[PDB]
């Protein structure tokens, strides 16, 4: 059995929601909240462990964005800390290659981070890699085939919609074609060996499209649009299905959960998280 795990979040200010959908049963379980309340960050899962990566703790009392690594245990219900990034990152994305977490972008007061650095679970330990050609706030992150893929974004100035491919062993950065829409705060995942980036910001509108990258063509090519724009969602892959949870919509955090089936290439509203949120870290365990 395995569960959609939001972590954090910002609704007026930041959040320590930690909360799992049962797709089957409709249920949002309450979970351990998170040490920090924390928006701006990204999930992952390795090992079984949920990771909570980054963003920025935007309390009442204070802005500061967050270095920081945290690890929540489903066994245990709790979280324990892990060593931090070497420099804070908001509105980071992450993705995992061999069992290592790979941190990418984000920013750090007025830096936008070019810098891309890696995790060890083994050895708890952060080491830096090759920057990305491009500094990236807001930048949606993905794995195909053991390779990892940096996708739209904000680099302070200018919104994108150019992608940049990372090879871990040559330890080296590769433009790609870029997507047709320009997105920061898009939500890219990878279902079914393809790409996904859904919605976005572009500087003006918040975004419903769709569009879906192909290796093999290296195209990116739209697909079916979200019922909902949406601008820093959440989004995961769970039994062959795309979720993108909350985000935000020019007006109002969204609370509403949207379903992509690939194969009638339809969204779906299946659930309402228990409040309106945007900046999750959402991951399956």
Same mark, same amino acid.
């Given at each position: ?101 790979? &941190? /990418? +972008? *984000? ?6 981070? %070019? #810098?891309? !650095?890696?995790?060890? $679970? @083994? =050895? ?25 893929? &940096? /996708? +739209? *974004? ?6 994108? %919609? #150019?992608? !940049?491919?990372?090879? $871990? @062993? =040559? ?25 996904? &980036?859904? +919605? *976005? ?6 975004? %419903? #499209?769709? !569009?879906?990258?192909?290796? @093999? ?28 949870? +909350? *985000? ?7 609370? #509403?959960? !949207? ?27």
């Amino acid at each position: 059995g395995r569960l959609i795990y939001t972590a954090g979040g910002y609704f007026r200010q930041s959040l320590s929601y930690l909360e799992a959908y049962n797709p089957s049963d409709g249920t949002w379980l309450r979970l351990a909240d998170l040490q920090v309340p924390r928006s701006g960050l990204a999930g992952c899962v390795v090992g079984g462990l949920l990771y909570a990566v980054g963003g920025r703790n935007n309390s009442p009392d204070g802005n500061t964005d967050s270095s920081a690594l945290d690890c929540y245990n489903p066994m245990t219900n709790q979280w324990s800390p892990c060593a931090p990034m070497s420099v804070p990152r908001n509105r980071i994305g992450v993705g995992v290659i061999d069992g290592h977490i790979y &941190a /990418v +972008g *984000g920013s750090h007061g007025c830096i936008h981070h %070019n #810098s891309v !650095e890696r995790y060890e $679970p @083994e =050895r708890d330990e952060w080491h830096l890699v090759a920057p990305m050609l491009t500094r990236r706030i807001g930048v949606g992150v993905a794995v195909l085939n053991r390779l990892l893929y &940096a /996708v +739209g *974004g904000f680099d302070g100035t200018n919104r994108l %919609n #150019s992608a !940049e491919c990372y090879y $871990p @062993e =040559r330890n080296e950065w590769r433009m790609i074609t870029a997507m047709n829409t320009i997105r920061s705060g898009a939500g890219v995942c990878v279902l079914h060996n393809c790409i996904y &980036a859904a +919605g *976005g910001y572009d500087g003006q509108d918040q975004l %419903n #499209s769709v !569009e879906r990258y192909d290796v @093999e063509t290296e195209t990116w090519t739209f697909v079916a649009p979200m019922k909902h724009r949406r601008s820093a969602l959440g989004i995961t892959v769970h039994q062959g299905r795309i979720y993108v949870l +909350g *985000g935000y919509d020019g007006h109002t955090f969204l609370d #509403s959960v !949207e379903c992509y089936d690939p194969d009638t290439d339809t969204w779906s509203e299946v659930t309402r998280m228990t409040s309106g949120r945007s900046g999750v870290g959402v991951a399956v365990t």
